Design an enzyme around this catalytic site. Sequence first.
Site, PDB file in Angstrom:
ATOM      1  N   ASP B   8      48.326  59.557  67.911  1.00 59.93           N
ATOM      2  CA  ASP B   8      47.637  60.003  69.119  1.00 59.93           C
ATOM      3  C   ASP B   8      46.179  59.993  68.706  1.00 59.93           C
ATOM      4  O   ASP B   8      45.891  60.077  67.516  1.00 59.93           O
ATOM      5  CB  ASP B   8      48.096  61.404  69.563  1.00 59.93           C
ATOM      6  CG  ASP B   8      47.363  61.925  70.796  1.00 59.93           C
ATOM      7  OD1 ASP B   8      46.812  61.099  71.551  1.00 59.93           O
ATOM      8  OD2 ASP B   8      47.339  63.158  70.996  1.00 59.93           O
ATOM      9  N   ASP B  10      43.113  61.865  70.267  1.00 60.57           N
ATOM     10  CA  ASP B  10      42.543  63.206  70.327  1.00 60.57           C
ATOM     11  C   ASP B  10      43.378  64.227  69.552  1.00 60.57           C
ATOM     12  O   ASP B  10      44.528  64.474  69.893  1.00 60.57           O
ATOM     13  CB  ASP B  10      42.367  63.612  71.797  1.00 60.57           C
ATOM     14  CG  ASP B  10      41.564  64.873  72.008  1.00 60.57           C
ATOM     15  OD1 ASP B  10      40.353  64.860  71.701  1.00 60.57           O
ATOM     16  OD2 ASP B  10      42.133  65.854  72.549  1.00 60.57           O
ATOM     17  N   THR B 122      47.437  56.842  73.382  1.00 61.35           N
ATOM     18  CA  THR B 122      46.518  57.837  73.925  1.00 61.35           C
ATOM     19  C   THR B 122      46.466  57.970  75.459  1.00 61.35           C
ATOM     20  O   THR B 122      46.524  56.976  76.174  1.00 61.35           O
ATOM     21  CB  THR B 122      45.123  57.669  73.258  1.00 61.35           C
ATOM     22  OG1 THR B 122      44.230  58.673  73.728  1.00 61.35           O
ATOM     23  CG2 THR B 122      44.490  56.279  73.484  1.00 61.35           C
ATOM     24  N   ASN B 123      46.318  59.211  75.954  1.00 64.30           N
ATOM     25  CA  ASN B 123      46.126  59.487  77.371  1.00 64.30           C
ATOM     26  C   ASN B 123      44.607  59.411  77.494  1.00 64.30           C
ATOM     27  O   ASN B 123      43.905  60.263  76.943  1.00 64.30           O
ATOM     28  CB  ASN B 123      46.681  60.878  77.758  1.00 64.30           C
ATOM     29  CG  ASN B 123      48.171  60.890  78.070  1.00 64.30           C
ATOM     30  OD1 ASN B 123      48.851  59.851  78.041  1.00 64.30           O
ATOM     31  ND2 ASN B 123      48.712  62.063  78.402  1.00 64.30           N
ATOM     32  N   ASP B 184      49.139  66.087  68.712  1.00 67.16           N
ATOM     33  CA  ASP B 184      48.723  67.480  68.629  1.00 67.16           C
ATOM     34  C   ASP B 184      49.267  68.282  69.822  1.00 67.16           C
ATOM     35  O   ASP B 184      49.203  69.520  69.810  1.00 67.16           O
ATOM     36  CB  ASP B 184      47.197  67.598  68.552  1.00 67.16           C
ATOM     37  CG  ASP B 184      46.413  66.971  69.683  1.00 67.16           C
ATOM     38  OD1 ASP B 184      46.936  66.040  70.328  1.00 67.16           O
ATOM     39  OD2 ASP B 184      45.254  67.376  69.892  1.00 67.16           O
ATOM     40  N   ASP B 334      22.788  36.503  42.791  1.00 71.07           N
ATOM     41  CA  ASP B 334      22.809  35.353  41.896  1.00 71.07           C
ATOM     42  C   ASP B 334      21.792  34.302  42.401  1.00 71.07           C
ATOM     43  O   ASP B 334      20.607  34.624  42.450  1.00 71.07           O
ATOM     44  CB  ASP B 334      24.259  34.830  41.726  1.00 71.07           C
ATOM     45  CG  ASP B 334      24.445  33.761  40.681  1.00 71.07           C
ATOM     46  OD1 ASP B 334      24.502  34.104  39.485  1.00 71.07           O
ATOM     47  OD2 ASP B 334      24.552  32.599  41.056  1.00 71.07           O
ATOM     48  N   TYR B 382      24.806  28.049  29.358  1.00 71.92           N
ATOM     49  CA  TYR B 382      25.649  27.519  30.417  1.00 71.92           C
ATOM     50  C   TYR B 382      24.796  26.698  31.423  1.00 71.92           C
ATOM     51  O   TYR B 382      25.252  25.647  31.853  1.00 71.92           O
ATOM     52  CB  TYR B 382      26.456  28.656  31.078  1.00 71.92           C
ATOM     53  CG  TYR B 382      25.679  29.485  32.076  1.00 71.92           C
ATOM     54  CD1 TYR B 382      24.779  30.456  31.655  1.00 71.92           C
ATOM     55  CD2 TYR B 382      25.838  29.294  33.448  1.00 71.92           C
ATOM     56  CE1 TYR B 382      24.051  31.214  32.570  1.00 71.92           C
ATOM     57  CE2 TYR B 382      25.106  30.034  34.372  1.00 71.92           C
ATOM     58  CZ  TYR B 382      24.217  30.999  33.930  1.00 71.92           C
ATOM     59  OH  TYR B 382      23.505  31.748  34.836  1.00 71.92           O
ATOM     60  N   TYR B 465      20.956  24.339  40.230  1.00 68.95           N
ATOM     61  CA  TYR B 465      20.519  24.510  38.826  1.00 68.95           C
ATOM     62  C   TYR B 465      19.783  23.309  38.276  1.00 68.95           C
ATOM     63  O   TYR B 465      19.218  23.371  37.188  1.00 68.95           O
ATOM     64  CB  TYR B 465      21.729  24.671  37.924  1.00 68.95           C
ATOM     65  CG  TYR B 465      22.511  25.947  38.053  1.00 68.95           C
ATOM     66  CD1 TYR B 465      22.219  27.049  37.248  1.00 68.95           C
ATOM     67  CD2 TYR B 465      23.650  26.008  38.852  1.00 68.95           C
ATOM     68  CE1 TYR B 465      23.015  28.195  37.269  1.00 68.95           C
ATOM     69  CE2 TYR B 465      24.455  27.147  38.881  1.00 68.95           C
ATOM     70  CZ  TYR B 465      24.141  28.233  38.076  1.00 68.95           C
ATOM     71  OH  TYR B 465      24.909  29.370  38.131  1.00 68.95           O
ATOM     72  N   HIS B 523      28.887  40.756  36.726  1.00 69.07           N
ATOM     73  CA  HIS B 523      28.240  39.746  37.571  1.00 69.07           C
ATOM     74  C   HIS B 523      28.718  39.663  39.032  1.00 69.07           C
ATOM     75  O   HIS B 523      27.927  39.256  39.903  1.00 69.07           O
ATOM     76  CB  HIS B 523      28.348  38.346  36.924  1.00 69.07           C
ATOM     77  CG  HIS B 523      27.507  37.320  37.618  1.00 69.07           C
ATOM     78  ND1 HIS B 523      28.045  36.474  38.567  1.00 69.07           N
ATOM     79  CD2 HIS B 523      26.177  37.104  37.543  1.00 69.07           C
ATOM     80  CE1 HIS B 523      27.042  35.743  39.010  1.00 69.07           C
ATOM     81  NE2 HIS B 523      25.895  36.082  38.418  1.00 69.07           N
TER      82      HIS B 523
HETATM   83  O1  LIG Z   1      31.977  37.300  33.221  1.00 67.93           O
HETATM   84  C1  LIG Z   1      30.921  37.764  33.745  1.00 67.93           C
HETATM   85  O2  LIG Z   1      30.710  38.961  34.089  1.00 67.93           O
HETATM   86  C2  LIG Z   1      29.798  36.821  33.951  1.00 67.93           C
HETATM   87  C3  LIG Z   1      30.008  35.584  34.533  1.00 67.93           C
HETATM   88  C4  LIG Z   1      28.960  34.702  34.715  1.00 67.93           C
HETATM   89  C5  LIG Z   1      29.216  33.367  35.358  1.00 67.93           C
HETATM   90  C6  LIG Z   1      28.448  33.241  36.674  1.00 67.93           C
HETATM   91  C7  LIG Z   1      27.616  31.977  36.778  1.00 67.93           C
HETATM   92  C8  LIG Z   1      28.401  30.731  36.398  1.00 67.93           C
HETATM   93  C9  LIG Z   1      29.073  30.838  35.036  1.00 67.93           C
HETATM   94  C10 LIG Z   1      28.955  32.209  34.398  1.00 67.93           C
HETATM   95  C11 LIG Z   1      27.688  35.087  34.316  1.00 67.93           C
HETATM   96  C12 LIG Z   1      27.461  36.322  33.744  1.00 67.93           C
HETATM   97  C13 LIG Z   1      28.521  37.171  33.561  1.00 67.93           C
HETATM   98  O3  LIG Z   1      28.272  38.391  32.985  1.00 67.93           O
END
Ligand SMILES: O=C([O-])c1cc(C2CCCCC2)ccc1O
EC number: 3.3.2.10
Lengths: 546, 546
Positions: B8, B10, B122-123, B184, B334, B382, B465, B523
Amino acid sequence: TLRAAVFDLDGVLALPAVFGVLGRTEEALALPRGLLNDAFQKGGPEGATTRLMKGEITLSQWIPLMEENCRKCSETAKVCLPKNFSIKEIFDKAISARKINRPMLQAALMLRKKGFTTAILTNTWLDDRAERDGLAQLMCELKMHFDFLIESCQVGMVKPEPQIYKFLLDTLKASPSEVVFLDDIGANLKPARDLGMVTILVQDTDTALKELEKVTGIQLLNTPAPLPTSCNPSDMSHGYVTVKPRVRLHFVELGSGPAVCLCHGFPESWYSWRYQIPALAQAGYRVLAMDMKGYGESSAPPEIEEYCMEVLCKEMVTFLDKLGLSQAVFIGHDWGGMLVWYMALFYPERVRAVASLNTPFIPANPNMSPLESIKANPVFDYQLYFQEPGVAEAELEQNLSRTFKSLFRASDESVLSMHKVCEAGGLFVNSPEEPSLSRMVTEEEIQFYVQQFKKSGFRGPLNWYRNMERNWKWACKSLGRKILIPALMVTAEKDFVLVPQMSQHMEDWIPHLKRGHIEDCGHWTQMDKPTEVNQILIKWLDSDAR
Amino acid sequence: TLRAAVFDLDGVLALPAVFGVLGRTEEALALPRGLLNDAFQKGGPEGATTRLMKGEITLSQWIPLMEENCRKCSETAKVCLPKNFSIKEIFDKAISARKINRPMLQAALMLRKKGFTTAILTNTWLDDRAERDGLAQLMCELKMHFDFLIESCQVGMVKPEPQIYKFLLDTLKASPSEVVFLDDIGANLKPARDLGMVTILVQDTDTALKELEKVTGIQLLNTPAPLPTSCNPSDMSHGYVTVKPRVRLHFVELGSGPAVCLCHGFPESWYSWRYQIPALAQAGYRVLAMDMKGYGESSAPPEIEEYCMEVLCKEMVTFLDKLGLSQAVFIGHDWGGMLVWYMALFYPERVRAVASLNTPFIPANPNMSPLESIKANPVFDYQLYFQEPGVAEAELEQNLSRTFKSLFRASDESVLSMHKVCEAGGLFVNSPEEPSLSRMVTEEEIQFYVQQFKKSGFRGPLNWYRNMERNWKWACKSLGRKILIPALMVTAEKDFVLVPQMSQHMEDWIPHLKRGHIEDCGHWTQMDKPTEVNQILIKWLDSDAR
Ligand SMILES: O=C([O-])c1cc(C2CCCCC2)ccc1O
Ligand SMILES: O=C([O-])c1cc(C2CCCCC2)ccc1O
């Protein structure tokens, strides 16, 4: 204008409400919310509860049908009822726990005092439980203060059906707008409201009564302390016992239990105890308010010797013997107080307990003639005036209204002298012909004593004082005795004749004696301060006479 | 077995109950007890309230009919209604004061999570009050979490009529004993009970839920802290804007008010913001969760130069221009976080406020080539691996499930290396072929990212990138500038690449910058600690972006 007030019992006149005990039992046993209240109302007008409220079955018959509906609701809710579950024990507790809502009863009484018509309108059952006496004791105590009592189980109808509202309206002989209706059940007010009656939903007593005063225009809250419940001579059980061929005694009976024989003074009545008979019966006593020999409806022989303590106490014993009573608690005042002390000295077997208001126990002096003893104290001059046969009768039997209006007065209001009553030529010599009305008594209460004193007069009443020599010779036989039975002495602060100090030595004669004392209280103890008399007497009776 | 729960509104799903506001108004204005609640229910099924609950009249139409019945009840009770009495003001207050009973909504959600079918019965009325928006905002927020919503005013029936119970039962496609019903109103449960459904009278929430758990055999009380409400991609409004002939951008829309453009990172989606879109829309914002260029349903051109910050920010500006938005709050994470800082540097007119999760603002070095800057820090290896075209695509586009399961993991659960990613020959070289499922994501959530990445791949995503040199030349034009618009930087404690310390100096560039910080957060900020993200973002939005 409003002229009728209607009270519901459960939640309004009596607390706590039995509806609440269902909600309390669900919390204690941790059963789902409203499980018991829904099993109680299952079926609606077709269910076991309605058949009970309409009066088709008894509450003993109802118990297993609720139990069935409780089992049924718990099955649907997908829960379990406990091991030691008993509907009987739950209701037994709830009924016994329920007591009168005193501020509500006082509001009813105040409304009815201002001429209002009052009634209890309740959805009730026909209680055949082995413990039914409790609900019965309760009902009697409320019912007595209301014009009507409408019990749904006796009429065959129930709230909220429209018919009971038209039945009550017919009983009240009033129209809707003339009626105030008080209920704790919101839906039970809706029919009464639709009809045009003023309605009050009773949650708390204080707000309910605040609505009840705003609407009546009559004060019900913050009122002064109310007087105890009195007697209407027409509504009492009147009793008559013949003690001897020429003499018969009359009494008024109220209550069940240990017999409590009330003995009035001079120039009084069974009615002097009016504010004590209902209270004492309520406390669990069989009250027997005597019309002592020479008063009201008891026989008044003309001879002086018929009023000596020995003759009067043999007659109180014969009264017991004829009524089938082996014992009686003996509570006296003034002259009855004297009779009561000598009842304990000469007949302790027949006296359960002994109480005296104002009158003290004082032994005889075997070395002094009682006449010398009366002259010795200035306050007792009125007793010397009562001696000559015919003298005080003529003065007291002259204008009965004037006599009782001049006598029945509170300490301050006193219009009497009592210093050389003999010399001045009477009790009322300097009292007005038309005295004002005392705050202790009504006009109607005065008018009752007038009617009573018209039958026999003051010869018999005054003859109680004309046996001082006879009383003394008999009392001297009891000189080596002690009163060793329960005893209560009650002194009154402003009693100018039967002074508190006159009782000071009584312990030499009654060692285990209990005491009471009322302040700003004159000779007319019972009507001066009834509430205090009641509180003292009930307390001593419960502690000393079961 | 039980498979349906009925709530319900109310008194059950929303508190305080509107029935209670009538009882509260009688106490405040010192009107007799139940006067307003009786005037509300006058007529019963024939009255103005039933016509309102059935939906024959509007609540604006109803107001003067209640007012009439209030005047009528006060006349019968022999009382007076005040000077400034307005039914509209009483209801306006009661509606606006009424909010969601959160523990009840969580019980519903937990039941529905365990497969239960849920519905609001509900009413209700058809609210045409100038202040109707408030009740409407409330309803939307509850409705969304339940399978059905049965509003008496739309169906033409009311509780306690038996028909609505047979209607709801039919809608639920379940039988009585399969249904739990919470109300209620004691009388509104009686029909549901008579039918065989499990009933719960809701007085307090804690006892109601205790009955609701004992009966379901499912834990609802003392549960751990719940996750914020997420998105079902099928239930969102999907938007598409063409920025240039070859490029189109896709977004998801929820809420009304100031426009809040959400910008995801790599390798993410509009879905990365799933736990933020409902919360932020609830906070009074128009949420626009982007599928940035190269992802999901936005166009993914193959050229590297299509992903330089200058091209992407012109496209975010064109997007605004085509949607008719002069401004937008820009919240990035990011790579979106980078886009967002450069949105503020190059286009402050179009940016209302700027917030960044994990990504810091760091100016260009006009004295150092950006390649040298990446080599200089071991965690950024990376990024060097992502440089050679085709290399990381082949590894990331190999087994999409494995890719997202290996990446979307909380700090502790991390199966990735990130120290000489180039040397080792890839990101997943020492990661399993079948990684375990993270506690942050479901199988279904992983399976959504897989479907999305099947359309375009990782060329476009990785090309963000591959513009470090282009990004640097453009950024150097902004070297003498400062970010003087509202700004919020959010650091994540366990982000091993975008470390909290990397943001330390940002004040030299953004003096009035507000900060946030999440502990034990990696991340994947948005799904790691959604609740904290929500609390931080809503707080900064209300204080800095109206
Ligand atoms: O595992 C994590 O927390 C973690 C993962 C990444 C990825 C994000 C970008 C692409 C490849 C790395 C970067 C920092 C981190 O701290
Ligand atoms: O006025 C009084 O309170 C009061 C009245 C009396 C009367 C009772 C017995 C017969 C005549 C006197 C005695 C003492 C008093 O104190």
